[PDB]
């Protein structure tokens, strides 16, 4: 499957693509404002994630640091990024279907559109100003809006027993982006696509 990753932000981001134990395609790249990066993701990829990183410094070797979505100091992510991270999430060719979503479960750094470029299902978007509106206790100093689980490390927020409810914090994310996961047991906003759909992830789809 092809993912076109487009940075419509006025600022540079460092796109990342990982399935948690491995990079997807190069795993990461600088996107200046307006740049497009096309990656190939192996069919049957389960638990794929794409995100943006902000305010990165990388040396000649691809080692450095991001204020959001840092994946162990690497340009080319092998691991998931240090939330806050708006997440494009995908499981591909799963009994003949692709499953896509956006998640705020790991918080929010960059607004995002996640849409197929093939037909047979709709895209999802979380493009509200969640950073601007972020409750004070979730504000990440480095930029972005943390989920309550990252900040407070409780069973309720992290859903550790597999029993928990919505929260004041999850409802903030859900009110601004109804079409994204706000917490682990949120009523699914997973979209079902045809197997072997192609996609576009757009950072700052409206801005």
Curated annotation (Swiss-Prot):
Name where it's found. Cytoplasmic vesicle
Q: Which family does it belong to?
A: Belongs to the thaumatin family.
Q: Does the keyword Signal apply?
A: yes
Q: What does this protein do?
A: Taste-modifying protein; intensely sweet-tasting. It is 100000 times sweeter than sucrose on a molar basis.
Q: State the organism named in the record.
A: Thaumatococcus daniellii
Its main subcellular localisation, reduced to a broad class, is: cytoplasm
Which key words tag this protein in UniProt?
Cytoplasmic vesicle, Disulfide bond, Signal, Taste-modifying protein
Superkingdom, taxonomy of origin: Eukaryota
The UniProt entry's coiled-coil ranges are none
Q: Name one Pfam family in it.
A: Thaumatin
| Protein name per its UniProtKB record | Thaumatin I
List residues traversing the bilayer.
Answer: none
GO CC annotations on file: cytoplasmic vesicle
Asked if Transmembrane helix is a keyword of the record, the answer is no
């Amino acid at each position: 499957a092809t993912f076109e990753i487009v940075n419509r932000c006025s600022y540079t981001v460092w796109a990342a693509a990982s399935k948690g134990d491995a990079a997807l395609d190069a795993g990461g790249r600088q996107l200046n404002s307006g740049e497009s990066w096309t990656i190939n993701v192996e069919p049957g990829t389960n638990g794929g994630k794409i995100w943006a990183r902000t305010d990165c410094y990388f040396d000649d070797s691809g080692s450095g640091i991001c204020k959001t979505g840092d994946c162990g100091g690497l340009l080319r992510c092998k691991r998931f990024g240090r939330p806050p991270t708006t997440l494009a999430e995908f499981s591909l060719n799963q009994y003949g279907k692709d499953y896509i979503d956006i998640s705020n479960i790991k918080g929010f750094n960059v607004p995002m559109n996640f849409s197929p470029t093939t037909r047979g299902c709709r895209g999802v978007r979380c493009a509200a100003d969640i950073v601007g509106q972020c409750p004070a206790k979730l504000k990440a100093p480095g930029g972005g809006c943390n989920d309550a689980c990252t900040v407070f490390q409780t069973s309720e927020y992290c859903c550790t027993t597999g029993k928990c409810g919505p929260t004041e914090y999850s409802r903030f994310f859900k009110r601004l982006c109804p079409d994204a996961f706000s917490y682990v047991l949120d009523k699914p906003t997973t979209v079902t696509c045809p197997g072997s759909s192609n996609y576009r992830v757009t950072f700052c789809p409206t801005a």
